[PDB]
Amino acid sequence: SGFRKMAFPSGKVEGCMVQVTCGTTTLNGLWLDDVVYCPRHVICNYEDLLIRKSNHNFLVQAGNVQLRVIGHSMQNCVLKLKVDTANPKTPKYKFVRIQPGQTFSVLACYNGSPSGVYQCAMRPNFTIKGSFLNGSCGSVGFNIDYDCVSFCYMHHMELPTGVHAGTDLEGNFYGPFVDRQTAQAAGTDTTITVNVLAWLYAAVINGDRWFLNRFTTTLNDFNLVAMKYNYEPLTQDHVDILGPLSAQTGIAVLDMCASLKELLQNGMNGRTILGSALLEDEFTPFDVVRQCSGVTF
Amino acid sequence: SGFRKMAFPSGKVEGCMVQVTCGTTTLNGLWLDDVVYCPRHVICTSEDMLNPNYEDLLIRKSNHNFLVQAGNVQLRVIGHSMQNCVLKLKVDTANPKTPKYKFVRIQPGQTFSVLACYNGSPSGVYQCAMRPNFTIKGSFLNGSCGSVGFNIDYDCVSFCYMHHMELPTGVHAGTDLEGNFYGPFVDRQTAQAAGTDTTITVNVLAWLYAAVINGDRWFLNRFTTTLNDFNLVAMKYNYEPLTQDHVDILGPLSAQTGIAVLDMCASLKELLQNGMNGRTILGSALLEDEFTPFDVVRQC
Numbered sequence A: 001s002g003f004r005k006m007a008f009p010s011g012k013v014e015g016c017m018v019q020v021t022c023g024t025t026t027l028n029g030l031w032l033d034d035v036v037y038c039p040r041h042v043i044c045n046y047e048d049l050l051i052r053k054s055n056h057n058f059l060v061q062a063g064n065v066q067l068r069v070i071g072h073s074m075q076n077c078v079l080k081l082k083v084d085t086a087n088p089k090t091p092k093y094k095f096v097r098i099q100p101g102q103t104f105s106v107l108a109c110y111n112g113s114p115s116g117v118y119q120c121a122m123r124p125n126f127t128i129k130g131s132f133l134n135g136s137c138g139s140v141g142f143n144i145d146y147d148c149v150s151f152c153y154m155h156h157m158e159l160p161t162g163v164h165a166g167t168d169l170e171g172n173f174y175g176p177f178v179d180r181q182t183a184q185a186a187g188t189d190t191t192i193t194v195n196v197l198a199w200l201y202a203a204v205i206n207g208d209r210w211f212l213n214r215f216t217t218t219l220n221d222f223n224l225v226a227m228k229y230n231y232e233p234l235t236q237d238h239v240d241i242l243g244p245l246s247a248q249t250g251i252a253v254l255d256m257c258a259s260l261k262e263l264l265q266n267g268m269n270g271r272t273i274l275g276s277a278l279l280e281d282e283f284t285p286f287d288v289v290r291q292c293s294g295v296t297f
Numbered sequence B: 001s002g003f004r005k006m007a008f009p010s011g012k013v014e015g016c017m018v019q020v021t022c023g024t025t026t027l028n029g030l031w032l033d034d035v036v037y038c039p040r041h042v043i044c045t046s047e048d049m050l051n052p053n054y055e056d057l058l059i060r061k062s063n064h065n066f067l068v069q070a071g072n073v074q075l076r077v078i079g080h081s082m083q084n085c086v087l088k089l090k091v092d093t094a095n096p097k098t099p100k101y102k103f104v105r106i107q108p109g110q111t112f113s114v115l116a117c118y119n120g121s122p123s124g125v126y127q128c129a130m131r132p133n134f135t136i137k138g139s140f141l142n143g144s145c146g147s148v149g150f151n152i153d154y155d156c157v158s159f160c161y162m163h164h165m166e167l168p169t170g171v172h173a174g175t176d177l178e179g180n181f182y183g184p185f186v187d188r189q190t191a192q193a194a195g196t197d198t199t200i201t202v203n204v205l206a207w208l209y210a211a212v213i214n215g216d217r218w219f220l221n222r223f224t225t226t227l228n229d230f231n232l233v234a235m236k237y238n239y240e241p242l243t244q245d246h247v248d249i250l251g252p253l254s255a256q257t258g259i260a261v262l263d264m265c266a267s268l269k270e271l272l273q274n275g276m277n278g279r280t281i282l283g284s285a286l287l288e289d290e291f292t293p294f295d296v297v298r299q300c
């Protein structure tokens, strides 16, 4: 029993964190094999700023060891610093681009030193509600699938509302953001519906059934109600993905949707679900299955 | 900006997790140098659990009865001793991944990270607090016993908890790394119930200061309170008594925000009275009590 916001073990990622300094700017880098990946704004027309830099302008520190940069190239908004030493702690890894609603762990770092790990989701507006201070740029987001680390995010900036923006490890931003000091605002956010349903199933698995009802709904009627409450449209794929949870609890996805529809139109009425007075949307259906089954890495 | 429940990076702890098997029971162990620490109930059957005589069960065991697996390598047990509710298995290999560590016993209200493990393999990391009733509201399934709680401060891992059991209410009980249980619990299948839980007041105040630091002042008021009057109100909401030590510990946050601890106590009193009225504080519709004053200073 128990349901917590759980992050993946950060060990395979900690062994990759390095400190990158370029002039006055100091941020974090991801050292995988002989390449250190970091936000290209460490050089701060990026092509023009980068061509004026030489390898020895980039100081890379892996713990108490200085790595010597032997090359540099830019891929989108990520700078790839070729180093002389291959990281012996390089895990089995992939660079994956995630979709809004998908969750991941963030190993927040300052000066190439990991300080904390937390779990979060890519919001439908492509921002992440992270916890980042100055110096955290280059901190990465990841998932683990067996022994393989799937790097999915690299922190680049904080928006004026306190939310965060970043890229995949190929340097492509999530959302309509640019790595430039300019007027940028997060779009209106929506609740990740499939995740709220998954979290309601996690509540049922943990013995919290007060919100269940005898009603069901059509998928179209649910989406008409959901659109009004700034909830993401629930697709047939979302219904299919919730299938295993529906089978485990004996509650049809559209039956759980009628419970969610009632929670949206009526509130919780002084009650909580899994110790929460708000509907949680940062657990995917897979996170619920992985946690209420004990999958290991 | 942003405020999240943040666990410590689990790497230094992952390199210590091992699987311990004794007969049919399989749980986790903490391999530090040449000793593997694990709950002593690894030697118990489900029948033994009612009234186990651990001294009697342990004297019937030999080193080779304990199978210890570190990844895909079997460790040879060369000795065994019991310290309170922890079994200490002497092994023939010192863990090369042993970090700088301490065994610390924490007090209620203190927070820590839990690296939940199954079969000596880490599956997830989460942050939590030692409740005033000495339980932890963890997320543990069968096989998670021996998973540990820790804090990491300046390259040193402070092991503070080892998971032993789940109470009938779904909350968890365990020991420090010297095998002393937190709370009035025993490693016995007997009628054990968690005491009435209370909110960690000093932590809610710290989290209200974190909200002020992040630009949220809606809950503040023109009032102050006496410490005694605050405690009289707090007791009625099942909030832990706030002591002068708690007031002293909140001092740096009070100086950083310019809000006296007793003025913040007055906002808390008003929040308990009024509720949040559709508003949130740091994205929460409830008053958060699992961030200590030290965690707030750390994260901000």
Ligand SMILES: COCC[C@@]1(C(=O)Nc2cncc3ccccc23)CCNc2ccc(Cl)cc21
Pocket: A001, B025, B041, B042, B044, B045, B046, B049, B140, B141, B142, B143, B144, B145, B164, B165, B166, B167, B172, B186, B187, B188, B189, B190
């Ligand atoms: C022989 O070992 C028994 C373990 C056991 C226990 O609580 N295990 C678990 C611990 N944590 C999360 C659990 C989630 C679901 C189910 C079991 C879980 C089983 C129950 N009676 C008991 C009594 C005293 C003590 Cl100290 C341990 C236990």
